[PDB]
Ligand binder design. Structure first.
Ligand SMILES: [Ca+2]
Ligand SMILES: [Ca+2]
Ligand SMILES: [Ca+2]
Ligand SMILES: [Ca+2]
Lengths: 154, 154
């Protein structure tokens, strides 16, 4: 005799026997007789997304879409443009406003945040089937098993 | 026979014997026969203060006065307003521009960067010679040796 055998309480609801049937104790994220109805966290917890952010309800959670002036999962912290720095590949971040920034890239990279590595391979001198490998404003030839050299010619 | 006995080479210049006299080997910061003339680092090293900063020569060193857009001893890093945060006493920094900020103080503090602790002592109820001690939007009475209590009345 185990009415819970069937696993009726979903999404983490505890199942307990109750009279002829069972009974679900639901989690904070769901509700209903089986814990299969999503809780709208935005409506039950107003101001969940602080500092003017928009709350979007999800199934089993929610997400906050912050104003440009704030960040975090609930917009709790102000947005400081160059911390954490967005500029990848050792570029230099410079603030340009309250919510804006600008990246000064090292030679060899481009993009808004130094994200893309310029393809240095066109015009390479890798010979005898050696493959060209893009680098820090340069290239390297990966030679096949019967060649050595900077260009696979030795 | 020790011509250097007199300690003639100043500001860290090494003294060595040379002919009848001595001779000074000067440090980078000074020059002259005794290392007593200051070196003007600004003029001998141009661009010492990076990103448009002004170099002011000092005796035995120099100092850089940066543009608002940069910081460091030589203006090498850009200025990021809320990192390191200026707001003292657990206040919240909010950027308001490229080089400007604003602090949201916790209750009990005021000033541009939450620096001053509001004097909560006027109107205190510290009795029997007990001194008032300002606090986190509150006060405490430091009682004399024959009194106890929140107000020194027990
Ligand atoms: Ca939800
Ligand atoms: Ca490259
Ligand atoms: Ca100097
Ligand atoms: Ca106070």
């Amino acid at each position: 005799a185990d009415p819970c055998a069937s696993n009726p309480c979903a999404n983490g609801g505890q199942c307990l026997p109750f009279e002829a049937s069972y009974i679900c104790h639901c989690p904070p994220s769901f509700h209903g007789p089986t814990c299969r109805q999503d809780v709208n966290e935005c409506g039950q917890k107003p101001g969940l997304c602080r500092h003017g952010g928009t709350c979007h309800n999800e199934v089993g959670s929610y997400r906050c879409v912050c104003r440009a002036t704030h960040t975090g999962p609930n917009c709790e912290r102000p947005y400081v443009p160059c911390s954490p720095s967005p500029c990848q590949n050792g570029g230099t971040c410079r603030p340009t406003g309250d919510v804006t920034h600008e990246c000064a890239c090292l030679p060899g990279f481009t993009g808004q945040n130094c994200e893309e590595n310029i393809d240095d391979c066109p015009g390479n001198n890798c010979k005898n089937g050696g493959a060209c490998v893009d680098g820090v404003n340069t290239y390297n030839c990966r030679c096949p098993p019967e060649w050595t050299g900077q260009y696979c010619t030795e």
